[PDB]
Amino acid sequence: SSFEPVVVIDGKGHLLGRLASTVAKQLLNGQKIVVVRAEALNISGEFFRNKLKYHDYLRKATAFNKTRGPFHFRAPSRIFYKAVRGMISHKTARGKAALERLKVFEGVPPPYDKKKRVVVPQALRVLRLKPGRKYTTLGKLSTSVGWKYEDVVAKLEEKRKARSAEYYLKKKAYNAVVANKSATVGTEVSEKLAALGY
């Protein structure tokens, strides 16, 4: 409950229509967003369902000109950006607004792999899906209905992580080291004090 500028969400983990029924209340509230990592969403549903379900949209189309007819993106990204531009009044100016506040990628696309993402707990699939309940992973599902890029988002990833790893040793280092002084400075008066203030 804080009105940041942007907010990044590591899609990873999150269920869907949950982490998605919020991302949506957080647009019609001016908030912003930017769910990264989609390719990792988790939708209740044993893979095989969730993909008959799909083959139950993929097959709805404007009879007479299958073009106008609902556009079935596959894009892991998009698969969870409908589920939204689906939970919003998106035909009322104040709707576009919304969906214009909500970028959405899979794997993490710069302007972001350098900002802290944050995970909408009320969604995770580790705080809901009663353990055992089979669940899936867009990142697949998708893969199984046209997305031409996972294998190329399993690349660009690692390549990432690696860095964001080799950038979390430079962090530690810097710290434990900063924690060896907090001590040398510990006990001091300055503290016996702030040691109360708090």
Binding site: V178, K181, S182, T184, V185, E188, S190, E191, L193, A194, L196, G197, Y198
Partner: protein, 136 residues
């Protein structure tokens, strides 16, 4: 090795004498024991020392601390209160970093604006020595 190895999984047992921090309700952030136990969800607490009266409670409504102590199952209050003292569970709890972090955030909220401004001045002073120590 040759010594097998299993991780193993360490937990907090809801057992008899697992002291518990009551999350919500009239008690609210008090210790008590889980005396008798009813079933998976339901348990029966008492922390007469703390002042949280004997009651069945949902184990969602409570939280298990790492502390345990000696109780016999179905121990009334007056029993519990005695064995509580002999173990010295409230003093074990007080020392725990959990309890220290609880009493901190309360003490933070208690601070006056003036007393909070002190903390700008003192925190500032701490930086300077730290940042100076960082170069060295």
């Amino acid at each position: 090795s040759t010594d097998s190895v299993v991780k193993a999984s360490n937990w907090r047992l809801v057992e008899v004498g697992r002291v518990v921090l009551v999350k919500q309700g009239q008690s609210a952030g008090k210790l008590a024991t889980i005396v008798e136990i009813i079933d998976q969800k339901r348990a029966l607490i008492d922390g007469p020392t703390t002042g949280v009266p004997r009651q069945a409670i949902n184990l969602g409504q409570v939280v298990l601390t790492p502390l345990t102590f000696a109780v016999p199952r179905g121990a009334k209050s007056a029993t519990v209160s005695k064995k509580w003292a002999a173990a010295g569970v409230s003093e074990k709890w007080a020392t725990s970093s959990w309890a220290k972090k609880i009493a901190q955030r309360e003490r933070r909220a208690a601070l006056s604006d003036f007393e909070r401004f002190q903390v700008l001045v003192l925190k500032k002073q701490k930086r300077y020595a730290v940042k100076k120590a960082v170069a060295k």
